[PDB]
Structure 1
Amino acid sequence: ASNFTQFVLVDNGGTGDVTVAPSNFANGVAEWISSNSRSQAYKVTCSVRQSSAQNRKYTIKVEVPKVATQTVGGVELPVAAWRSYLNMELTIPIFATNSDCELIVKAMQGLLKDGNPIPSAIAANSGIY
């Protein structure tokens, strides 16, 4: 095995899909980027540290760019109009078994499933009410 593989970050039914690939592992931070110029690429990073004697902490970061072409000094450069940032920290006690961890993954997947509250609010630019 080796879980450091490329994957589809944004699924648009096989066409216009955004896949992200392994690009760096320096300093214990695993990185993935899309096939773009570093200035217009999607970025995903992940790292795990035993933050305490009895805790392990995963730090995950995702960057979604709004691509654009900008004219600087009368020349066109590929760039990002702006970026959206997702920063998440997951603290798991060392006593958690593999099945305990699978439970955490399922909860995170159910949290963001289409039709549920949170993803519905985010997609509609509103709060929860």
Structure 2
Amino acid sequence: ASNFTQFVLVDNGGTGDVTVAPSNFANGVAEWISSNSRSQAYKVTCSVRQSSAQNRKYSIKVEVPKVATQTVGGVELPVAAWRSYLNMELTIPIFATNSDCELIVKAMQGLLKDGNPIPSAIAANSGIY
């Protein structure tokens, strides 16, 4: 293997896709970034450690730019009004085999599949009801 490659983060169906490419590997923390200023880029980071004697933790962070009314390459302040922050921590017991890990991955992709409650709540600016 060699996982550290460029990938499509936002698939707008071939036209207008957001591709994110490797940009840093300092401290073993893989970073991928889109082709933008760092204030407006889509950014993804990922790392793993053995968090405890019985667990490993994957730390994954994503930054997504607010695009509506965005001025490309402009100075947009305050920074917090223009960015969303995703923070995922995945704790997996040291006993999990690859198959167990494949299942955990499916559970994560099922949670966010289109039409499912969580992604539709988020996309509609809503809570659960």
The CA deviation string for residues 83-120 of structure 1, in whole angstroms up to 9 with x for no partner, is 00000100000100000000000000000000111111
Q: Work out whether residues 71 and 77 of structure 1, in 8 Å CA contact, stay in contact via their aligned partners in 2.
A: no
Q: Work out whether residues 36 and 73 of structure 2, in 8 Å CA contact, stay in contact via their aligned partners in 1.
A: no
Provide structure 2 residue ranges, at least 5 long, that are not aligned to the other structure: none
The CA deviation string for residues 13-36 of structure 1, in whole angstroms up to 9 with x for no partner, is 001100000000101211000011
Number of equivalenced pairs: 129
The runs of 4+ residues in structure 1 deviating greater than 6 Å are 68-80
- Summarize the Cα distance change of 1:3–1:75 in structure 2 as closer, same or farther, 3 Å threshold: closer
Residue identity over aligned pairs, in percent, reads 99
Q: Work out whether residues 68 and 78 of structure 1, in 8 Å CA contact, stay in contact via their aligned partners in 2.
A: no
Q: Work out whether residues 56 and 91 of structure 2, in 8 Å CA contact, stay in contact via their aligned partners in 1.
A: yes
**Counterparts of 1:16 and 1:71 in 2: how far apart (Å)?**
17
- Summarize the Cα distance change of 1:74–1:29 in structure 2 as closer, same or farther, 3 Å threshold: closer
- Cα offset for 1:76? 9.8
- Summarize the Cα distance change of 1:96–1:123 in structure 2 as closer, same or farther, 3 Å threshold: same
